[PDB]
Structures are given as structure tokens and as C-alpha cells.
């Protein structure tokens, strides 16, 4: 994964992109299409463009550039925030508390038991299946950080 | 992973949890401790507590239950939001646009060059090292979604 400061580096340069997301988007796609022409053939609405000049002139190529960098920006900002929130918890449970993944499984089953007992109206079979998958994904994230830190959990 | 409706089911039952986080946190730790006595040994503050009635009387156990469900809740809500943002992107690039992972490596290459070219003051060796790793994490997330969908590309 990235460190705390590694994400801050990423978000700082991303702010600069957002000051002219249109121009950045355009240049990224044109650099892609010139360096790797086979990428242009995946785009039914752009593959007619032959020259740099035609590409720079395309209103919709510039609009698509914005759509791509906006979506990627949103994803990176969520990853940064999510990592900063998870890594402290993973570190303390790995190093200080030394909690095996097995014990995270037990507390996952305890949550599902309590939600079945107290909220069956918003916890039918489907919603229970959903929570079981959700808590497994959470354990998997922790297990991934445990490995990064070389704690056998 | 979870479908759109499954994440909504998770968020919907979590809303009920957060409405009585005190009581739910207590019931989760009592269920864990009574089902798996070994887990009580990890808790210096609680390991003397011998019965549900003792555990229910512990103000410390209640406060810890709140800290646990508060931390978990934040992680689940972020995961639901990020997945609902990522899953459609991966779905469309796999099944509609048919974009191999190697082409996301190409566009990552172009994003690095455009950032180095236009914002070098904000894009030194470390900043560029950070962005390179961050774009890898993005491609790995799409790659993990493609594998789920049995798209090789
Ligand atoms: C950082 C990488 C990428 C991001 C964030 C991104 C994002 C997007 C978004 C948000 C859309 C519109 C919604 C959708 O159809 O899912 C889209 C459409 C599309 N993307 Fe991507 N994309 C990326 C990489 C690529 C690459 C490398 C290719 C092809 C070589 C590609 C080909 C397409 C195509 C063909 C469309 C459909 C465009 C249309 O509506 O005519 N994408 N992309
Ligand atoms: C959903 C699972 C879990 C969550 C979200 C969680 C969260 C937390 C948080 C936020 C803290 C306080 C800050 C910290 O030290 O990181 C904490 C402390 C702790 N956790 Fe966990 N925890 C989980 C599972 C477990 C399990 C299963 C055990 C043991 C079986 C455990 C043992 C501890 C201990 C011993 C502490 C320190 C308690 C204290 O000194 O007051 N945790 N946990
Ligand atoms: Ni978002
Ligand atoms: Ni948060
Ligand atoms: O794209
Ligand atoms: O915990």
C-alpha cells in the first residue's frame, strides 16, 4: 500500500489536475492514442480521428478526458481516506493486541447473531448473506495489512 | 463481492445498529465472550467478568462495544460507497468496452508523463513514485473485478 504522506503527495498533485481537468484529460488521451494506437480502436466514437490536430479539435475527446480524470480522482480520494482509516486499526490489532483472523471471524459471527436476534425485520436471509460477505471483505482487508506488516494472524 | 442491493441492505441494517450503538456494542461483546471464552483473555479490563449479568454491568465493556461498532461502521460505509463507484466502471470496461488491464497500464503511463510535464514543481521523484503505486492499486482493483466477472483481458 501507500504511506500517509505518499497519499498526501498524490492528492496534492491531483488538486493541480482539477484546476484544468479538461486540458489534462485531453493531453492524457492524446498521449495514450499516439503512443499506443491500438487503444484508439476501442473507441467507436473517436477511432475516425487520424491526426493530432483532429484529436485536439474533437469537442467530445476533451469532454471524455474530463469524465476519465474525474472518475479516477474520485476513486483515489476514497482509497486515501479508506487506507488512513484502516491502517491504524490493522497495526494495533497486529502488533499491540495480536488478534488472529480467527478471532475477527468469531466477532463477525457475534455481529450477525445479534443482528438476527434484534433486527430480523431488516435482516432476512438476503440481508444476512450481504452482511456475511461485507464482514469477510473487512477481515480480508485486515489480513492483507497483517501480511504487509508480517504478523501471522 | 456485493451487488448494489446487497450494499444497501448492509447500510440499512447498520442504520438500525447506529440508532442503539451502546446496547448493540454490549450485546456483540457479550455474545463473543460467552461463545468464545478464549477471546475474553485478550482484554485485561474484562477477563475477570464471569457471567452475562457481570458483563452487562460493566460500563467499560459497554464503552468498548461502542468504539468497536463505531470503527467497523465507518469502514463498512466507506466500502459500500467505493464499491458502488468502482463496480460499474469495471463492469463496463470488461463487458461493454472490452479494455484489457494492459491498456489501463498504458493510460497510467500517460497520466504520469502529463503530470511530470505540466506540474514538475508538484511532481518530484517521491510524488511520482507515490502516483505510480496509487495507479497500480487502481488497476489491481479493476483486475480483481475482471477476475470475478471471468474477463481475462
Ligand atoms: C484510468 C483509467 C480509466 C478510467 C478512470 C476510465 C473511465 C471511464 C468512464 C467513467 C467512462 C464512462 C462510463 C463507462 O462507460 O463506464 C468510460 C468510458 C469508456 N472508456 Fe474508460 N476509463 C479508463 C481507461 C480506459 C482505457 C484505457 C480505454 C481504452 C483503451 C477505455 C475505453 C473506454 C471506452 C471505449 C468507453 C466508452 C466511451 C463512450 O461512451 O463512447 N477506458 N471510461
Ligand atoms: C470488528 C472487529 C474489530 C474492530 C472494529 C475493533 C476495533 C477496535 C478499536 C477501534 C480499538 C481501540 C483503538 C485501537 O486500539 O485500535 C480496539 C481495541 C482493542 N481491540 Fe479491537 N476491534 C475488533 C476486533 C477485536 C477482537 C476480535 C479482539 C479480541 C478478541 C480485539 C481486541 C482488542 C483489544 C484487546 C483492544 C484494546 C482494548 C483496551 O485496551 O481498552 N478486537 N478495537
Ligand atoms: Ni464517491
Ligand atoms: Ni471516514
Ligand atoms: O475511458
Ligand atoms: O476490540
Swiss-Prot record, chains A, B:
Catalysis performed (reactions): Fe(III)-heme b-[protein] + nitric oxide + H2O = Fe(II)-heme b-[protein] + nitrite + 2 H(+); H2O2 + AH2 = A + 2 H2O
Subcellular location: Cytoplasm, Sarcoplasm
Any one annotated GO CC term: sarcoplasm
GO molecular function, one term: nitrite reductase activity
UniProtKB keywords: Cytoplasm, Heme, Iron, Metal-binding, Muscle protein, Oxidoreductase, Oxygen transport, Phosphoprotein, Transport
Coiled coil: none
GO BP: any one term: removal of superoxide radicals
Binding residues annotated for nitrite, in chain numbering: 64
Phosphoserine PTM sites in chain numbering: 3
Signal peptide coordinates: none
Positions of the Globin domain: 1-147
Binding site for O2: 64
UniProt keyword Transcription, yes or no: no
Keyword field contains Iron: yes
EC number: 1.7.-.-, 1.11.1.-
PROSITE patterns: GLOBIN (PS01033)
Superkingdom per UniProt: Eukaryota
Positions contributing to heme b binding: 93
Quaternary context: Monomeric.
Family listed: Belongs to the globin family.
Summary of the function given for this chain in its UniProt record: Monomeric heme protein which primary function is to store oxygen and facilitate its diffusion within muscle tissues. Reversibly binds oxygen through a pentacoordinated heme iron and enables its timely and efficient release as needed during periods of heightened demand. Depending on the oxidative conditions of tissues and cells, and in addition to its ability to bind oxygen, it also has a nitrite reductase activity whereby it regulates the production of bioactive nitric oxide.
Name of this chain's protein: Myoglobin
Amino acid at each position: 500500500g501507500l504511506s500517509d504522506g505518499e497519499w498526501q503527495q498524490v492528492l496534492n498533485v491531483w488538486g493541480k489536475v482539477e484546476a484544468d481537468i479538461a486540458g489534462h484529460g485531453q493531453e492524457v488521451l492524446i498521449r495514450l492514442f499516439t503512443g499506443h494506437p491500438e487503444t484508439l480502436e476501442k473507441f467507436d466514437k473517436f477511432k475516425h480521428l487520424k491526426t493530432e490536430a483532429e484529436m485536439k479539435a474533437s469537442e467530445d475527446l476533451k469532454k471524455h478526458g474530463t469524465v476519465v480524470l474525474t472518475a479516477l480522482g474520485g476513486i483515489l480520494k476514497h482509497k486515501a481516506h479508506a487506507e488512513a482509516e484502516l491502517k491504524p486499526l490493522a497495526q494495533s490489532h497486529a502488533t499491540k493486541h495480536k488478534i488472529p483472523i480467527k478471532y475477527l471471524e468469531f466477532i463477525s459471527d457475534a455481529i450477525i447473531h445479534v443482528l438476527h436476534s434484534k433486527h430480523p425485520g431488516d435482516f432476512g436471509a438476503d440481508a444476512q448473506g450481504a452482511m456475511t460477505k461485507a464482514l469477510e471483505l473487512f477481515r480480508n482487508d485486515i489480513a492483507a495489512k497483517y501480511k504487509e506488516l508480517g504478523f501471522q494472524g
